[model samples]
Target chain A: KNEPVLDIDGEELRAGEQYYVVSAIWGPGGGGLALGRLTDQKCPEIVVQRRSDSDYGTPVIFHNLDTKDDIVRLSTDFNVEFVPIRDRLCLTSTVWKIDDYDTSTGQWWVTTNGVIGNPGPQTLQSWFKIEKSGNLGYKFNFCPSVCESCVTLCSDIGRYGDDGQIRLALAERGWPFVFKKA
Target chain B: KNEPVLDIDGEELRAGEQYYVVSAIWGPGGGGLALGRLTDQKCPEIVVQRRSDSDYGTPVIFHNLDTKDDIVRLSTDFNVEFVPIRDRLCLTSTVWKIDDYDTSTGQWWVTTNGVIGNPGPQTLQSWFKIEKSGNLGYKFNFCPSVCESCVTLCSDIGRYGDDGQIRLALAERGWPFVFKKAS
Candidate 1:
């Protein structure tokens, strides 16, 4: 049930290092899905984009930014965001949190409006985890373990095809990916 | 997100009230298609039998099922049980519940596979709702927000593959219908 998550090089993920998180499955041009801003949103929203469709997409870094163990731990709280400013205006923490329930797509939605740093008041919604899947791939999760006494929600992080594009969301189906060093 | 499920007479639906669930759309025979049980596997199953077929079908009743309220609200968990006028002889008089999540066919099936009156862990699958759609018509919902702390599904109930049977099943698009108080 517990295995230290590894990167493409089989080495453990370390904080502050930029990595291009790419979809594992080889379809529609072989793992072209990468993290990027939903250009269509008035304010930048984190969504998946086809790598061939964008300029290498946006490289992301895990926000553990800590020296202790320094590796991205499994099932432990962590924050994630894209590396570049991408857009000059939407100056919010690129960190992620589950957004309001979308009735159109009966799936859990996420937004970049999350706490910028470590565990705190709003971090309850920002905390996420990386779980190793049986498919030899990794999945992001919304099971916030940062606060002990706080009410929690546990669901697998994945993507869904909606509104003419695929955005990172939660559904019964889990989308898997591997991280490549940028 | 939370609104009372108003019935045909522009009033909220209440439990312990007998009503005929008639289809909003004009039926095949245009004589009002209503809900009734079509006996399958010798156990009664929920279906929309044409009104021209049987004697106005069967008038059904709702149960708050939870001890929370006596009123039935939209998208909330509740149970619909049949009220028999005559005798057909069934199991504990038949309460409506989803049958099973078909692994291969992938359908949110609705059946009489529920308990008589007991509605709890032993009868969790028995919950259903009358969710409002934009067309002013309503559809049955399997999604229950009652259990806030529990992880539940968001699905809609509609007829699928209606060749001979009209058992309610889950689909991408929900089948709409209306309620008429038994006259």
Candidate 2:
């Protein structure tokens, strides 16, 4: 459809000129990427945040981890980006390992050694939220258990505090898991 | 881009060819569509079935019944087809009446009262199931509950029966409503 409907002559083709007047286009630096904690070895390094309405964003966890905390606590470290393929969401990050949790106050917090790759544990870093402005929103992928094939379990996040917090519960093997989101 | 890139053949035309092959390109026949009883009324008189791979055709359901079983129960009074958009599963239907289960044996049954528009009761006609020959899948409205935008939900039908059929459940009020294939 880009086959210009008609050819119009113009000079110089000034740089930074608005292609066609529209509301806006945002990239990582200005309004998409956000920062979060770098948990231990088993943290899902990327949390994709798809913009909802007004300016809110929905966050998703999509990474594999290996830790005792991964079996109990929630790791919050990731970098999020928008996938141009049908405007899908993509999270790019390295792996890690670590385990610790606090049940009394419902807080599982731990830090990484920052040593990357083979020698050091995995580090979960960075996050981002991107979408076209207004009510009509875009799609984002968050479930990693199905890895390359999951499509359900994702819902919308539209306001402040709707999806601001990033955390998930890892229920034990034999014990029943009860969820209480704070 | 192709024209600018490969300009050797001044015009975009191939020299060799006998004649253009014609295709039937037949679509679903919509007129004289037969609709089954209660279940048929839940939806518009529409039919959707993919050819089955166990070598049948892609899954297909007669308009009135969701599967072959629902039709068998009707003996002779069962059928329907979609209008406007054919060959696609419908997510929502216009319920015209209610035909409740007998409750004694828990057998699901409904009788269509001819073609009465306002049949008095509101009941679900039939639930649509994914009948693909390959991976079973269906699309859900993305702005779901709000708009008609949808996404695809799929399951491995091969694992069904033995692994257990996963019921498509809906939450109404404070209870979970499990949808199943009618026998």
Q: For residues B73-172, could you state the per-residue lDDT of candidate 1 as single tens digits? A: 7776777876754355555445777776767567766766465446455566777778775553688887755455666667777665443655568766
**TM-scores across all candidates?**
0.46, 0.20
Poorest stretch of ten by lDDT in candidate 2 chain B: B21-30
lDDT (tens digit, per residue) of candidate 2 on B74-153 = 12112221222323443443221122444543322222322312111121232222211211111111011111243322
Q: Can you give the DockQ of every candidate in the order shown?
A: 0.01, 0.01
- The C-alpha interface RMSD of every prediction is 17.7, 21.3
Fnat for model 2 comes to 0.00
In Å, residue A4's CA in model 2 sits off its true spot by 41
Query: Candidate 1: where are CA atoms >4 Å away?
Result: A29-41, A51-56, A65-67, A86-88, B1-183
Local accuracy by lDDT, each model: 0.65, 0.21
lDDT at residue B82 of model 2 (Cα atoms): 22
lDDT of 2 at A120: 17
